[PDB]
From a paper:
To gain insight into the evolution and designability of ligand binding and specificity, we analyzed the homologous PBPs, [name] and PotD, which are [name] putrescine (PUT)-binding protein and spermidine (SPD)-binding protein, respectively. They constitute the first elements of two separate multicomponent uptake systems (PotFGHI and PotABCD) to transport the cationic polyamines PUT and SPD across the cellular membrane. Still, the protein-binding modes differ: [name] shows affinity for PUT and SPD, whereas PotD exclusively binds SPD. Prior to this work, we grafted the seven differences in amino acids from PotD binding pocket onto [name]; this resulted in [name]_SPD, which will be referred to as [name]/D throughout this work to keep naming for mutants more concise.
We introduced the [name] exchange into [name]/D and into our high-affinity constructs [name]–Y87S–F88Y and [name]–F88A/L. The combination of [name] with the other constructs led to an affinity improvement with which the nanomolar range was reached for the first time, while keeping the order of affinities in the different mutants the same compared with the prior analysis. All structures but [name]/D–[name] adopt a fully closed wildtype conformation. In the [name]/A variants, Y87 is finally able to rotate toward the binding pocket and allows distal salt bridge formation. The orientation of the residues in both mutants is identical, confirming the [name] containing variant as a structural example for the noncrystallizable F88A construct in the first part of this study. Chain B as well as the A–B chain comparison behaves in a comparable manner. This deviation puts extra strain on the structure of [name] and especially the distal salt bridge since R91 is in the affected region. In general, the noise in the Fo–Fc map of this structure seems to indicate many flexible side chains. The “flexible” [name] structure is also the first in which we ever observed SPD taking alternate conformations in the binding pocket of which one does not mimic PUT-like positioning.
Residue numbers in the entry: 29 to 376
Write the structure that this text describes.
C-alpha cells in the first residue's frame, strides 16, 4: 500500500479531486495545505519537506531552482503532458528553462476583492472600484475602516502593488523606494487595516465581515460564489485595477528527496486529464494551464474577465522579480514594521 504526500495552497482543488484519485488508483493521499509562499519556501530550504509534490508559485520555483530542492520531471511518466498549452509553457519557461522542473497548474492575478454594496454605501455610487485608489488611498481606507479592510500577508505582493501605485517600477531594485515612499504609504494606511492574512479574507468577504481586501482573483470569485450559494444577499466582486496588477502562475513540482515518485507522477498525470483539471477550475474559479481542458470549463468561469482577462488588461499586468538579498532584507524589515505599525512605543 503506497501513500502520496501533497502540499498545496488552501482552497485550490475541487472537494472530490483527491477522493476520486484514491478511488481510481488505490493510492492513499495525505493532503496538506498552506496559504503562503514564505511557509513553503522555508520548509523547502530548511530541510526535508517529507512531501512528494508541492505547489510553489513560479517565481518561487525560479528563486530556489539553483538550490537543487526540486528534481526534474520525467516527461516519459507524464503521457498527458501534451494537454498543457504549449504557449503557456513558453511563458512559464522564463522561470523554469525548457520546462524541466514544473507543471503549470493555475494562473491568475492579485487585485481587489470587495463588497459591492457596502463600498457604495460608504464611498458613494462613483466609488473607484476600477482603481487601486479604492484600497491604497488613505482617505478611502479611513472611510472603509469600520466595514473591514484586509491585506494579504505577502510582502512581495504588497510592496510590488504599492510601488506600482506610486509610479515606481513594481520590481524596483532601489532600496530607498522600499524604505521611503512605499513604507510611508503603508504606514499611513496601516491604522485602517483590520488584518494581514492570505486566506481568512475569503469567508470574511463572503459573509459581509470584510468590505475590501487585497486578494487573489479566484479566491475572491470563490467568496462571491459562497455568498451566492448561501443566499445571504452579499455581493462580492473582484477588480483587476486600471493601474495594473501582479499576474502569476502556480506550478506543481517534485521535491528532490521525494519518496514516492511513481505515485506522484500518477497524480500529476491525473491532473493533466482535461476533465479533472476543468472540474477544479469550476470549483476554485482559477484559469488552468491545460489547453485540452478549456472547452470543459464552465461558461461562468470562462466568460469571467476577472478570471480570463482580455488583452487590454493583460497588457497592464506584471510579474514578480526575484530580488537581491539587500532588497529582500529591506523589504522584509519594512513589512515587519508596517504590520506592527499600530503598537505604541516609548523611545521618544
Ligand atoms: C476563455 O478561454 C481562454 C483560453 O485560454 C487558454 C487557456 C489554456 O489559458 C488560460 C490562461 C489565461 N491562464
Ligand atoms: C490569449 O487569448 C485571449 C485573447 O483575449 C484578447 C481580448 C479580446 N482583448
Ligand atoms: Cl452584511
Ligand atoms: Cl509567478
Ligand atoms: Cl457551463
Amino acid at each position: 500500500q503506497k501513500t502520496l504526500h501533497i502540499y498545496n495552497w488552501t482552497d485550490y482543488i475541487a472537494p472530490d479531486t483527491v477522493a476520486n484519485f484514491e478511488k481510481e488508483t488505490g493510492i492513499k493521499v495525505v493532503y496538506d495545505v498552506f496559504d503562503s509562499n514564505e511557509v513553503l519556501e522555508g520548509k523547502l530550504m530548511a530541510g526535508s519537506t517529507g512531501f512528494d509534490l508541492v505547489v510553489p508559485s513560479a517565481y518561487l520555483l525560479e528563486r530556489q531552482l539553483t538550490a537543487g530542492v526540486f528534481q526534474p520531471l520525467d516527461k516519459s511518466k507524464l503521457p498527458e503532458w501534451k494537454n498543457l498549452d504549449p504557449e503557456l509553457l513558453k511563458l512559464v519557461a522564463k522561470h523554469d528553462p525548457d520546462n524541466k522542473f514544473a507543471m503549470p497548474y493555475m494562473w491568475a492575478t492579485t487585485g481587489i476583492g470587495y463588497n459591492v454594496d457596502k463600498v457604495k454605501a460608504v464611498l458613494g455610487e462613483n466609488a473607484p472600484v476600477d482603481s487601486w485608489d479604492l484600497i491604497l488611498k488613505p482617505e478611502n481606507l479611513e472611510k472603509l475602516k469600520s466595514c473591514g479592510v484586509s491585506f494579504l500577508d505577502d510582502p512581495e505582493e504588497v510592496f510590488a502593488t504599492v510601488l506600482n501605485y506610486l509610479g515606481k517600477d513594481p520590481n524596483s531594485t532601489k532600496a530607498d523606494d522600499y524604505t521611503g515612499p512605499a513604507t510611508d504609504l503603508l504606514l499611513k494606511l496601516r491604522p485602517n487595516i483590520r488584518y494581514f492574512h492570505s486566506s481568512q479574507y475569503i469567508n470574511d468577504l463572503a459573509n459581509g465581515d470584510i468590505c475590501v481586501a487585497i486578494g487573489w482573483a479566484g479566491d475572491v470569485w470563490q467568496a462571491s460564489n459562497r455568498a451566492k450559494e448561501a443566499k445571504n444577499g452579499v455581493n462580492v466582486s473582484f477588480s483587476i485595477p486600471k493601474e495594473g496588477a501582479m499576474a502569476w502562475f502556480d506550478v506543481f513540482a517534485m521535491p528532490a528527496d521525494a519518496k514516492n515518485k511513481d505515485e506522484a507522477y500518477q497524480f500529476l498525470n491525473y491532473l493533466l486529464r482535461p476533465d479533472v483539471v476543468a472540474h477544479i477550475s469550476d470549483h476554485v474559479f482559477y484559469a488552468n494551464a491545460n489547453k485540452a481542458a478549456t472547452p470543459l470549463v464552465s461558461a461562468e468561469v470562462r466568460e469571467n474577465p476577472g478570471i480570463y482577462p482580455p488583452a487590454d488588461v493583460r497588457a497592464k499586468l506584471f510579474t514578480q522579480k526575484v530580488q537581491d538579498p539587500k532588497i529582500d532584507r529591506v523589504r522584509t524589515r519594512a513589512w515587519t514594521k508596517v504590520k506592527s505599525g499600530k503598537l505604541e512605543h516609548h523611545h521618544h
